[PDB]
Amino acid sequence: YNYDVVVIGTGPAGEGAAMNAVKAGRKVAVVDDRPQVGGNCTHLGTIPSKALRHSVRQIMQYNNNPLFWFSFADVLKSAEQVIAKQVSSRTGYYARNRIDTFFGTASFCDEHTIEVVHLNGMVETLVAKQFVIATGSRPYRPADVDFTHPRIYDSDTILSLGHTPRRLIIYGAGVIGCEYASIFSGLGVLVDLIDNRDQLLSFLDDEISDSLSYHLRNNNVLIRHNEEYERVEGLDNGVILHLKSGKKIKADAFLWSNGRTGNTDKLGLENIGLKANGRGQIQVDEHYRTEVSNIYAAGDVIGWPSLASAAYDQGRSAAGSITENDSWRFVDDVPTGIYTIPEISSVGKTERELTQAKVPYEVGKAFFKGMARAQIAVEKAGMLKILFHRETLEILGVHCFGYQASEIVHIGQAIMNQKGEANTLKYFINTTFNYPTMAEAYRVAAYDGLNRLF
Amino acid sequence: YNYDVVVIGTGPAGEGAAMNAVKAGRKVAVVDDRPQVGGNCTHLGTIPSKALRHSVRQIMQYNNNPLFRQRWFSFADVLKSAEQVIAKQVSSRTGYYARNRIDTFFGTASFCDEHTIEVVHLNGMVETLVAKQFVIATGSRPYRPADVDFTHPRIYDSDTILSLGHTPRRLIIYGAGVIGCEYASIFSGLGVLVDLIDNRDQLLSFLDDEISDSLSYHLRNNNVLIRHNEEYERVEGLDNGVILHLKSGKKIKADAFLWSNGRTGNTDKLGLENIGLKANGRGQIQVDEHYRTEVSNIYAAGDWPSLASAAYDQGRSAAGSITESWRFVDDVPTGIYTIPEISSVGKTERELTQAKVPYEVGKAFFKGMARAQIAVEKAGMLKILFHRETLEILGVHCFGYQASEIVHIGQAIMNQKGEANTLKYFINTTFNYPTMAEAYRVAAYDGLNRLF
Ligand SMILES: Cc1cc2nc3c(=O)[nH]c(=O)nc-3n(C[C@H](O)[C@H](O)[C@H](O)COP(=O)(O)OP(=O)(O)OC[C@H]3O[C@@H](n4cnc5c(N)ncnc54)[C@H](O)[C@@H]3O)c2cc1C
Ligand SMILES: Cc1cc2nc3c(=O)[nH]c(=O)nc-3n(C[C@H](O)[C@H](O)[C@H](O)COP(=O)(O)OP(=O)(O)OC[C@H]3O[C@@H](n4cnc5c(N)ncnc54)[C@H](O)[C@@H]3O)c2cc1C
C-alpha cells in the first residue's frame, strides 16, 4: 500500500495527527494493535477510570443523601456503554474522512516501509513519505514483582477485579495512584497509599497537596511517606509487602502505579537507526521531529507530560509540522489535572516557584464552603487560589481544588494567555458571570486578592 | 485448524464429497482458489455453456416461428442471461454450505505432509489445516500447447471464449470433443460460419455410427464445415483474423479461434511430491476402485469421464469410502448438449457386432412424433438395442430435443437384473400423452415387429 502520512496507534495523539493530516488533503493511514480504535484513551486508561470515579461519586452522594454496599462489577458495568459510544464515534470519525485502518502490531523495516502483523498471521506492508509515532506507553513492570499472581494488579489488570477487597495497597503516589486511591476510598476500602517522597504530588502547590492529603487521610487512605519497597509476597488470601524501612503491610489485594514505560520494544527501532532511553521514550525537537527527518513522534510516547489532551494537541502540532501549514505549536503549558474525589487542577507557576523567583505576588482565596453552588451540590470541601502580580495585576498562577476544578481552571487559563495589560485580575471585576455557579469563586477570589493590596 | 475431512475444490465432486462426509457426522471443510463456490461446473464450464445453448435455441425458435415474426443480436447480450443463473446457483451452494456448518477457505491449497496443507490467498495468506482424511477435487483446465499464442486477442480456449465481446463473422474450432461440438453447434445457431477441425475421420467415434452421422449431417446443414483427419501445423494471429496452417497443406482464415483439444489436470500447484503422489502427463491421479490414491488417507475424485454428474457421484462415493455407500462410478450415460442433444447408455451397435450378440434394433423417429411436432423440433431419432431371445436391453441411443430426459427411462429399465430388464415393459406400461417418452413405446413396437 502507498500513502502520505502513516500513524501508529489510534490514541489522542494519533487521532489528532491523522485528522490534521487528512485536513491538509493528503492520503493517510492508521495502524493500531488493539482490535478497536481509541487505545488507552478509552480502553484501559482515561475512560474506564473516569467512569469508575463518577460512579463512585454518585454512590457517595446517594449514600449521604437524606432522600435515601455495591459490588465492584456493578460499579464497573457503567463503563462498557461509554467505551462503546466513544469507539463508535471515533470509528465514524475515521470512516467519514476516509482513513484506512489496520488492526495489527506495527514494526519497522526501513525508512519508508513497515510491517503490520495481526493475530491471524496476517502480513501487510505500508509505504508513506511521513510517519507519526503514537505508540504511547504501558505500565512499568519490575521483574521482582509476580504480576501473574491473581492478587497482584497493575493500572490495567486492576479493572479485572471481580470483588471489592476488604483492604488494599497502592504503590506510587503518581496521578494514577492517587486517583485509584480516591476511587477505592470512595468505594469503602481501607487503602494504604505508599509514596517514595515526603509530600504527595510535590510538583503541585503546597496548600493543594496538604488539603488533598488531609481529605485522603479523613477518607481511610493511610498515607506513608518516604518509602521504598523491598520484597512483595503473594499468598492465597492476601499480599504482604516488606518495605526497606522494615514495615510489613498485609492487604487483600495490591495495585502498582509507579511510572510508565514507552511502547518501543516491538516497534523495531533499530531498523531505522533510532534509539529509545530506559523509559522507552523518543527524543523530539520543538517540531516533534526525531533525528530522522521524515519520522515524527508525539504524545505520551515522548514522555512529558503524559496527558491525553496534551498528547492530542502534541499530535495535532506534529501533523501541522509535517504539513507545514502554520498550525504547529509546541505544547508546553499544559494545565495539570488530577481527577480524584474531589478534583484538582492548576495552571502556571506555584507559590514555591514564585517565592524562589522573588516575584512580588499576592494571593486571592475563595473557599467552597461558603458557596451557594458548592453547598447546593453538597460539596463542602475545596478551595480556589489565584496568584496575581501586585503592581501589574497579571495572573502568574491559578490553583483550584474541589468541585468542578478542571472546568473552573479553564477561565483562569484563558485570562492568563492574554498579552500585556489584557491579562489582568481586574477583568474578574469588569465581567459578569452567571449565578449561582462555581465560576463566581473567581469574583470572590479576585476581591480577596485586591483587598490585600493597599 | 483441525477437521476430520478436508476437501480441495468446490465443484460437484468436492461439494458432493463434503456433503456426504458431513452427513456421516464428521467435521469437514472445503478449500478452493475461486473467489466464489461452485467450481468450473458453474463459473466457467457447464452452466455458462448450457445457458448460452438454451438462449441460442430460444432465439432460433423465435426467428423460425411465424407467429413471432410480426433480428440478430450481439454475443454479449446472449451471454448476459447466464449471470442470473450463476448468481442463483452460487447463492444456493453457499446456503447449502452454511446450513451444514461447512468451513470454507478461499485460497490455493498446497501440500506440506500427509495430514496438513497450507492455504495461500491473493494477499500472501498462510493458513495451516490438518485433518485425518483428504479429498482431491481440483478439477482441470483447458490444455495449452506451447506453440499457440493464447495471449492473442483473437485466440481463445474453452474458458476465455466467454470474454468475446463481438460476434465474429467466421470462426475456427480445433478438437471434435464434446466441448468442441457443443460450441460449434451454439455458434452455428448464432449464425457464424464455423469450420470445425477433427483429428479423426469420424465425429465422436465413441458414439454409435448412426448418431454420429446424423449429427454430422445436421452440423453440415447448419453452416458448420467439418474437416476430417487433420492436424494443425501453425496458428498465426493477425490483426484482423486468425490463420491456421494444417499438416495437410491448407490455410484457413477466420475472425476468431477456439481450442477444445484435451484437458489437463490441476495438480501442479498441489505439490503432491511433498506427500509421495505423482501426476501423469495429463495431470490426472491414479486411483483404485475405492477412489483412493497410493496414500491411505488421500482420496481423489472427479476431474475420464470428466462429467459433472459423474464427478458428483465419484466425490460422494469417495466420501462414503472414507466413512465406510461406496459405489464405483463406471456406467455414465454419455450426454452431448448440441442442438439437438445427444445421449447414449449401454453398448453401441459396433461393440455388439464385434461381440456377435444376437440383438435387434427398434427405431422411433421424432419426425412423426406428436410432441416433437408441437415443439417444432422434428429432427430426431430414438434407437433401442434389445436382446432378441431374452428381450433384455443392451443399448439405448437418442439424438434429439430433450434427449437427456428421455434416456433416463431406458437407463432405469437397463439397471434391472435378469427378466426385470425387459423391453416388454414399454408395452405393458402406460405413459403420458402427448410426450416424447411415449416414443419409447413406439420404438418397442418397432422392435416387436422384427421378432419371429
Ligand atoms: C487510569 C488512567 C487514567 C488516566 N486519566 C487521564 C486523564 O484524565 N487525562 C489525561 O489527559 N490523561 C489521562 N491518562 C493518561 C492517558 O492514558 C495518556 O495521556 C494517553 O494515552 C496519551 O495518548 P497516547 O495516544 O500517546 O496513548 P495511547 O492511547 O496509549 O496510545 C498507544 C496506542 O498505540 C497502540 N500501540 C502501541 N504500541 C504499538 C505497536 N507496536 N504497534 C501498533 N500499535 C501500537 C496501543 O495499542 C494504543 O492504541 C490516564 C491514564 C491512566 C492509566
Ligand atoms: C464448456 C463445458 C461444458 C460442459 N458441459 C458439461 C455438461 O453438460 N455436463 C457434464 O456433466 N459436464 C460438463 N462439463 C464438464 C464439467 O466441467 C466437469 O465434468 C466437472 O465440472 C468437473 O467437476 P470437478 O468438481 O471434479 O472439477 P471442477 O468443477 O473444475 O472443480 C475444481 C475447482 O477447484 C478449484 N481448484 C483447482 N485447483 C485448485 C487448487 N490447487 N487449490 C484449490 N482449488 C483449486 C478450481 O478453481 C475449481 O473451482 C463441461 C465442461 C465444459 C468446459
Curated annotation (Swiss-Prot), chain B:
Its biological purpose: Conversion of NADPH, generated by peripheral catabolic pathways, to NADH, which can enter the respiratory chain for energy generation.
Top-rank taxon, per record: Bacteria
UniProt cofactor(s): FAD
Listed SUPFAM superfamilies: FAD/NAD(P)-binding domain, FAD/NAD-linked reductases, dimerisation (C-terminal) domain
Protein name (Swiss-Prot/TrEMBL): Soluble pyridine nucleotide transhydrogenase
Localization of this protein: Cytoplasm
Enzyme class: oxidoreductase
Pfam families with a match to the protein in the record: Pyr_redox_2, Pyr_redox_dim
PANTHER family per UniProt: DISULFIDE OXIDOREDUCTASE, SOLUBLE PYRIDINE NUCLEOTIDE TRANSHYDROGENASE
Cofactor, free-text remark: Binds 1 FAD per subunit.
Family (UniProt): Belongs to the class-I pyridine nucleotide-disulfide oxidoreductase family.
Annotated gene: sthA
Keywords: Cytoplasm, FAD, Flavoprotein, NAD, NADP, Oxidoreductase
An annotated Gene Ontology molecular function: NAD(P)+ transhydrogenase (Si-specific) activity
Enzyme Commission code: 1.6.1.1
Binding site for FAD: D32, D33, R34, P35, Q36, V37, G38, G39, N40, C41
GO CC terms, sorted: cytosol
Gene Ontology biological-process annotations: 2-oxoglutarate metabolic process; NADP metabolic process
Organism for this UniProt entry: Azotobacter vinelandii (strain DJ / ATCC BAA-1303)
Catalyzed chemical reaction(s): NAD(+) + NADPH = NADH + NADP(+)
